């Protein structure tokens, strides 16, 4: 308990905002609330009020809240709280962190609580580059605290604090049958099959976790498997405005292993999709800004029966592909299968204040 609390203050520091976390987990049933505090000394411009707002928007044209550049923006969730003078005391339920963060701080510490409803798109940004006919687009969760009389008043950069948290998505490992796929090929002039079977240890991976592909190849043919190629692909379907389907390998193992004619083979391959490598070039769905060590490869969007597909903005999903490349000595054919999995965000923690400030900024 050297408790980390992330602080950001006004450019001219009358307003300062504190949060317990920058990332807020979605456990499919309900999101971690945004419990925070606003520390303002009632002397500056609109000596009536300070407000805090949560905005969830899909944006296209840049990736921030900007005027020059924003070509499309679909609003997905907005919440406005009046944090000075305390509005009617029906949403008094405080949290254990908030109480520390008004006791440790002055009488000028006023809390806010945001509840994100389930089924929103998690944070996502996608960077089209060379290959594309498009520019930055993504989903942001923007917390903005600003002083005003009015709240129809034009907000002051002088008066504002603005900090982009992430809503990251978690799924629990559900056991059962693991992913499997298989195919059988018969090539010209023979009825001897080449059979490929693959399997992943799990369904629900978490960032950084390795994935173990179990491979079985029954080659009854007269042909040799020249190489084995295991790969991970991200597919990101833009569903809003300028639709597009992108596809990007994010892991690749092309081993020199061979299946000789009328033989069989099995080997468990392990590779991990990273993005750390060359920081993704173009077209890759990240869950954050490329510039931050903080951010991952996006998590898979979780779909439901009856779900409205388009208001999710980008549909993100991953598959493993296992390719056998076939030939015989001295126009060569390939036998492959594909297996989906769910890439998710790891949960951080299941392991008189001493509350100590971090400068809210991603590194």
């Amino acid at each position: 308990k050297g408790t980390r609390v992330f602080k950001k203050a006004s450019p001219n520091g009358k307003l300062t905002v504190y949060l317990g976390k920058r990332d807020f987990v979605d456990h499919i049933d309900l999101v971690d609330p945004v419990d925070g505090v606003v520390l303002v000394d009632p002397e500056y411009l609109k000596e009536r009020r300070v407000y805090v707002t949560l905005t969830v928007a899909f944006r296209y044209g840049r990736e921030d809240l900007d005027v020059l550049g924003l070509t499309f923006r679909k609003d997905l969730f907005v919440a406005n709280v009046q944090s000075f003078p305390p509005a009617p005391e029906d949403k008094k339920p405080l949290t254990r962190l908030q109480e520390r963060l008004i006791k440790k701080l002055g009488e000028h510490a006023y809390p806010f609580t945001f509840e994100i409803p389930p089924n929103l798109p998690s944070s996502v940004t996608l960077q089209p580059g060379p290959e594309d006919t498009g520019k930055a687009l993504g989903v942001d969760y923007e917390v903005k605290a600003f002083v005003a009389e009015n709240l129809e008043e034009k907000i002051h950069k002088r008066n504002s604090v603005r900090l982009v948290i992430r809503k990251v998505q978690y799924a629990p490992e559900r056991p059962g049958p693991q992913p499997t796929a298989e195919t059988t090929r018969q090539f010209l002039m023979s009825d001897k099959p080449l059979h490929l079977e693959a399997s992943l240890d799990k369904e629900i991976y978490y960032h950084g976790e390795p994935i173990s592909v179990n491979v079985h190849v029954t080659n009854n043919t007269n042909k040799t498997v020249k190489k084995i190629k295991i790969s991970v692909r991200q597919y990101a379907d833009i569903v809003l405005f300028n639709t597009a389907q992108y596809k990007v390998p994010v892991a690749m193992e092309e081993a020199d292993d061979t299946v000789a004619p009328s033989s069989t083979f099995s080997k468990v391959y392990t590779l991990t999709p990273f993005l750390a490598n060359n920081r993704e070039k173009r077209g890759l769905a990240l869950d954050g800004k490329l510039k931050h060590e903080d951010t991952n490869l996006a998590s898979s969007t979780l779909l439901r029966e009856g779900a409205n597909r388009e208001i999710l903005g980008i549909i993100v999903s991953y598959k493993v592909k296992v390719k056998l490349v076939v030939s015989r000595g001295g126009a060569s054919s390939d036998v492959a299968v594909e297996l989906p999995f769910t890439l998710m965000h790891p949960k951080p923690k299941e392991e008189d204040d001493d509350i100590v400030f971090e400068d809210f900024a991603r590194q």
């Binding site: 707002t53 907005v78 406005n80 923007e142 709240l151 982009v164 510039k291 900024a361």
Partner: peptide, 10 residues
């Protein structure tokens, strides 16, 4: 309609 309308690197 509940009201409507960062990332430093140098």
């Amino acid at each position: 309609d509940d009201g409507v309308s960062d990332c430093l690197d140098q």
